[PDB]
Design a protein around this ligand. Structure first.
Ligand SMILES: [Cu+2]
Ligand SMILES: [Cu+2]
Ligand SMILES: [Cu+2]
Ligand SMILES: [Cu+2]
Ligand SMILES: [Cu+2]
Ligand SMILES: [Cu+2]
Lengths: 278, 281, 275
């Protein structure tokens, strides 16, 4: 299993806010390439990221990040004049640090974790309209030595939608039996939810996997989440269970009935899925 | 009351889905003995359990389990043709595994924990109708060496009820001061809840007991929980607090007001509970 | 510095009184009830006798989370430990250190972030009391726990913070470098998500990792429901510098309707950039 290296170099990215089909709004790495969720940003602890951001909408937009260090000027709020006028640009700077023993003997928590970014000014001064229309995306900050996945998939419970999609339209994610699959799970909007995965489980801790025999973290397959919660994990696809179309869904009963459901399609090495209809 | 043995046996059990009185639906180990919650299934990591399931109802029913290992054919979903027709029988197979180091050097989590089973197919294709009406039950998978309890009690916040009971009708559970009591706590339905126990606290971790002095898990007496959450803990009945009628309730204020309350009745060795008058409760 | 080993028998007087316009509160002296009520701080092993007095015209009580108490200090009508109007009562709370039981398992100590509230005003679960402000924080410290420069209590009570009007904070001040303690309690009817701009904490007992072996998730956003309590300590402006740092419920209509405040972090000269 490939691991993350130590971090600490300055990076840059260009990010644009654009209007998408049906009045949805999204972030993209290039003009014309916006998505919901936004592009996945991956940093190692210690790295810095200057985000060259341009607003192409007819309303102000901003960029607010969870978990990472940033000055008040990268708050992404109107109150710290951190928002971007229509047609305007701005460079947001995010930083990350490693953990270590402080001067006072206490242990400073590193930046590592599953985080996210989103608008803070569309609709209201807390980004309610921005978030609803799709201005959010994931951010992973890794620790030196963190196991790397074969693939990462972002699942956002945005009010009563998954990734702003129409009810009962997934998304579905494919893997092969044995694949190390990373899930980033973010919630937004007004409602609480409970994320459930069939056939798989993870540890309720930073990485989603137990550090070893001495980790007392609960092993779960179901987790309550509220607006702006983020967590993540890695699983071995089909480990001890085999290939199949493995449901994931919100477990709030009316939410699953109304379409907060998707499929984690785990294929056999020949690419087929036993007992499934494609 | 001892320690869990290392698992590994092939077990078999017979499980039935049945109509109870008042339009409720339950699982039981024998016809005429269905209950809400269903029977407590208990396993040691490594055990294989073949659930010989019989659906005596006149609509399809299923059995979906959390946490344990199953092949997709024991998904218990219509979507994977794992439901049981009216009057039919089907063998569901659940497996469990010990933790251990993988070839890539990572640590694989074991099956141990507080889990549950429930219907996935009555009323809707997520079992909303079957869950609402009582088709759920607890599963405990023990890690080798886990401390065994003197008693285990299952408390299910199902919608606005506890174990599908009428408002303000318990259940109540009895212990003696010093008894090691295990609580399995499961939530189902539409609503978030907060589970609170007067006079007692636990660790927010796999077993509900701190591993030792190095375990940083929060110690709590109030825990938010949502549909399909399961957790558990073991407490020493009356430890440091004595005998009494110790309330457990949902702490969402209108929920307690409208019936989501019960009693942990902890008795002295002589079997008394001083001051306890059920007319005051 | 750091918290000592506990074991004092301490006492405190507590009054329940009416405040302006329907509000009810606990106070250390009459005419000085606050919302939330006064902070109570103890060391594991400490015993506390609360000499309580009810100045209200209806029964009131005092129920506490987490601490040891015998049944007679439950603070419930059901078990006959409520206080009649104009009455008095002594409620006793005990705390204990961690240690190994006779049966060989580890008994969790009392240390943690806790709270106390009414259990009999309005309903026999204190629904009317909690609604109007009868709640307060309790911290029980473990020997060696690091002590903070300041402690601030934030209660999400239904759609208010600390029963204050919408969009009125509260706001709290600090200096860059300060070790700041937050106590976060929830009451009432709604779930919430507590968010802090510019800072993070560990989701464990103290809010800070014990060392490098601590696998607790590090977070800046936490879901909470009625009667949940937690707390943490942060070094103000650590790696982020000074400014008006927002905290709020992240449920979107809740922030929009005014569950917001400012963690005002001043530079050593006492000024806040952008403010
Ligand atoms: Cu949901
Ligand atoms: Cu946010
Ligand atoms: Cu409830
Ligand atoms: Cu389920
Ligand atoms: Cu809120
Ligand atoms: Cu309470």
């Amino acid at each position: 299993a490939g691991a993350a290296p130590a971090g600490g170099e300055v990076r840059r990215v260009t990010l644009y806010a654009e209007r998408l089909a049906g009045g949805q709004l999204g972030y993209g790495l290039e003009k014309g390439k916006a998505s919901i969720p936004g592009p996945l940003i991956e940093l190692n602890e210690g790295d810095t990221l200057h985000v060259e951001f341009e607003n192409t909408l007819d309303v102000p937009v901003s960029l607010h990040v969870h978990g990472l260090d940033y000055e008040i000027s990268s708050d992404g709020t109107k109150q710290n004049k951190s928002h971007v006028e229509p047609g305007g640009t701005r460079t947001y700077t995010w930083r990350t640090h490693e953990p270590g023993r402080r001067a006072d003997g206490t242990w400073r928590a590193g930046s590592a974790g599953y985080w996210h970014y989103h608008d803070h000014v569309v609709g209201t001064e807390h980004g309610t309209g921005g978030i609803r229309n799709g201005l959010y995306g994931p951010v992973i900050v890794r620790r030196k030595g963190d196991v790397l996945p074969d693939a990462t998939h972002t699942i956002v419970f945005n009010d009563m939608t998954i990734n702003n999609r129409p009810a009962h339209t997934g998304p579905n994610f494919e893997a092969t039996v044995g694949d190390r699959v990373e899930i980033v799970m973010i919630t937004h909007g007004e409602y609480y939810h409970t994320f459930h995965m069939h056939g798989h489980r993870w540890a309720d801790n930073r990485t989603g996997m137990l550090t070893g025999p001495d980790d007392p973290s609960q092993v779960i397959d179901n987790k309550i989440c509220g607006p702006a919660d983020s967590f993540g994990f890695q699983i071995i696809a089909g480990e001890g269970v085999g290939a199949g179309a493995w449901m994931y869904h919100c477990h709030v009963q009316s939410h699953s009935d109304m379409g907060m459901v998707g499929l984690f399609l785990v294929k056999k090495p020949d690419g087929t899925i036993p007992g499934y209809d494609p």
